[PDB]
RNA sequence: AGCGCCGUGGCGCAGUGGAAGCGCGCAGGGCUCAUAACCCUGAUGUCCUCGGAUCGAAACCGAGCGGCGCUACCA
């Protein structure tokens with residue numbers, strides 16, 4: 001809350017958006033720990049722990065916490081680091097859990 | 111019916127520590143029923159309520175429960191009391207709880223008697239309560255004495271013999287309390303024969319088990335022998351166990367072994 | 378239809394029950410294998426040695442069935458101070474048809490004299506060939522006084538080695554050398570870990586065991602795989618006990634003596650003290666025959682210090698109220714076995730570890746107590762029980778004057794101070810009094826690595842006597 | 848085995864002789880632009896189970912159950 005809200009874009013996409021899948025390098029991951037400087041640690045669904053930058057259009061536009069499903073784009077020149085591109089608000093995450101693009105051993109439910 | 115204050119006057123005295131059951135609160139303060147005395151309300155001022163700063167009235171007042179209190183000013187023409195709760199010391203509340211508990215026990219006993227006899231509680235207090243408080247200073251202490259010594263009801267006129275008989279029945283049934291005097295003796299004997307000496311000391315100690323005070327030697331371990339007594343007067347058991355200690359020392363010293371004292375007789 | 382307890386009672390009655398010993402049998406005609414002796418009392422003491430966290434109580438209960446207490450709420454799992462007690466009656470099957478290895482069987486104390494053969498197809502009974510008492514010794518580096526006292530008491534030995542762990546175990550060598558000290562060659566080596574051992578690895582471990590025991594005095598010690606959890610390979614143990622271990626020389630002309638290892642206070646709590654019992658000395662009779670109601674005295678007895686620093690020794694006089702074997706009340710005592718002598722001794726006197734390894738002599742005999750003892754000691758070159766990482770296992774130093782050393786004189790654990798050192802003899806000053814009767818072979822331990830370490834054997838040749846005050 | 852202690856509503860506690868307790872939790876509401884702080888109201892029992900006296904028992908007591916601590920493994 002606050003007087004900040006009226007300065008915003010007022011982009012009201014409350015209705016159910018169509019979830020975006022993974023495309024040739026964009027992959028799903030889970031936030032493991034929150035770091036500083038606007039950077040996060042994402043355990044990808046491949047047995048690797050990538051370091052994902054909180055990225056443009058996402059920095060102060062959506063607020064993300066520990067244990068959040070996420071979509072992240074890799075970089076072919078440097079595999080260790082990557083960029084968080086989209087965030088799924090815990091509803092379509094269930095849908096992906098049933099469809100199982102990610103290993104179901106990562107069970108994160110409220 | 112519940113009336114007839116325990117103490118000397120229906121109206122309170124000056125600076126008498128009182129004992130409150132809160133009923134409701136108005137804007138000015140709390141009008142509170144007084145349970146230490148008969149029924150008359152007291153006024154507890156809001157500014158004189160809480161030791162801490164006043165922030166939550168209902169958190170501290172607790173409508174429907176009992177608490178400590180102190181009287182400041184009294185009215186002796188129609189009946190009014192000024193009361194405080196902030197100015198209660200850390201230790202006075204303990205004597206307040208004990209006085210509440212004993213006075214409430216007496217109140218419950220005599221209310222039971224009045225309900226059984228259907229006579230107003232004031233008349234039963236007229237025949238029982240304050241002559242007893244004059245004799246002993248506390249009706250509950252005199253009740254305990256009447257449990258032990260029945261000369262308590264001598265010199266007082268009851269409404270009927272049934273009243274005293276059923277009061278005695280109730281006090282024996284409900285106010286029934288013997289203190290376990292326990293001591294520990296360490297037998298450090300290394301002599302040739304001690305089992306015979308231990309048995310002789312056993313007999314010497316157990317033969318003095320009187321009709322009202324039965325002293326028994328309980329066995330738990332090799333050195334530690336427990337001595338148990340039920341002291342009804344609490345001033346005779348220690349001498350009984352001291353005599354037992356003398357007997358066991360006399361038995362043990364001459365045979366060759368030694369005995370040591372670990373825990374003397376104590377309540 | 379019949380309950381199992383009724384079946385056991387019927388077997389017990391058919392097995393002969395427990396015959397009661399005669400009040401006064403012809404003592405000169407009795408032998409440790411006689412029926413009146415064998416039916417209710419053991420004659421051979423067999424000790425168990427092994428490393429900690431190896432399993433000896435489990436092996437003991439697999440062999441005998443009598444569990445060791447493992448008491449005190451803190452010694453329940455780690456170590457035990459007092460030796461364990463167990464009783465197994467050795468039985469043989471008379472039928473020639475059944476194979477010899479499973480003919481023998483160790484049965485519990487309450488087993489009948491002739492119980493049925495549990496093997497299916499054999500309707501034979503069992504013949505009581507020998508009664509033995511199984512005692513567990515503490516295999517822990519600090520627990521040496523009790524272990525050495527037990528080894529003194531023991532007539533047979535059982536060494537336990539774990540196959541899966543390291544082949545050379547220095548505590549096993551410690552116990553074996555301690556047994557060699559006290560003239561005991563009847564040792565049956567037993568491998569505890571055979572279930573979890575491979576075909577060739579077990580052969581290699583056995584070859585290593587044979588390699589280790591080459592220069593020691595014990596040469597033909599039998600070695601037998603056993604199991605403690607599956608509870609198999611027990612009959613072969615009985616066969617080897619019967620064969621390899623004959624009866625030690627112990628007969629009726631020798632003077633009556635007792636060596637007490639443990640003391641018990643018999644006072645059941647809760648019940649009133651009017652019905653109580655005296656004090657129990659748990660002792661082995663390495664020589665002599667006792668009866669019901671005899672007159673005895675503990676020679677070291679009470680130790681006291683005067684204001685002048687003189688050590689007074691009070692012989693604890695006592696009338697033997699009764700003697701308890703494993704099963705029931707006996708009337709005569711067979712030498713060479715652990716017995717609970719319940720005498721008029723104070724239960725307080727038998728409260729703590731007080732009567733730990735003390736000599737007791739019957740009236741009409743005078744074991745001699747000493748303060749300063751002229752001893753003849755033999756040491757070894759290398760300390761046993763030290764785990765060196767491949768560099769010249771610890772070297773034994775010659776004893777120095779005025780050094781506190783733990784001497785186990787047969788049963789008495791005393792801290793001796795060296796007065797002088799000679800080529801083979803020494804003078805030991807004892808603050809705690811100790812006795813000497815005939816030989817009382819002595820185990821020597823030194824404080825080097827913060828704990829007692831066995832260094833060699835010794836024998837008493839002389840002593841400065843003290844006259845007890847009656 | 849005996850003796851000392853005890854018997855949550857989720858946890859720590861309290862009075863036990865007059866009948867469901869407090870605090871900390873949890874849910875909802877309030878103050879605040881918003882959160883924490885703060886304020887208000889609940890929704891949770893067999894104050895362990897079987898009996899005795901009693902208008903009353905959970906207490907008071909006893910005919911037991913279960914868990915902790917001292918004696919200490921009490922042949």
Ligand SMILES: Nc1nc2c(ncn2[C@@H]2O[C@H](COP(=O)(O)OP(=O)(O)CP(=O)(O)O)[C@@H](O)[C@H]2O)c(=O)[nH]1
Pocket residue numbers: 427428429430431432433434435436455456457514515516517569570571604605606
């Ligand atoms: N798997 C397995 N365990 C065994 C075997 N033998 C003994 N153990 C284990 O030994 C453990 C304890 O046995 P125990 O005899 O009481 O110990 P201890 O050797 O007497 C101790 P200390 O040497 O100090 O006297 C048991 O728990 C048991 O599991 C075995 O053959 N196999």
Ligand SMILES: [Mg+2]
Pocket residue numbers: 006010
């Ligand atoms: Mg706008």
Ligand SMILES: [Mg+2]
Pocket residue numbers: 433434445457461513
């Ligand atoms: Mg053991």
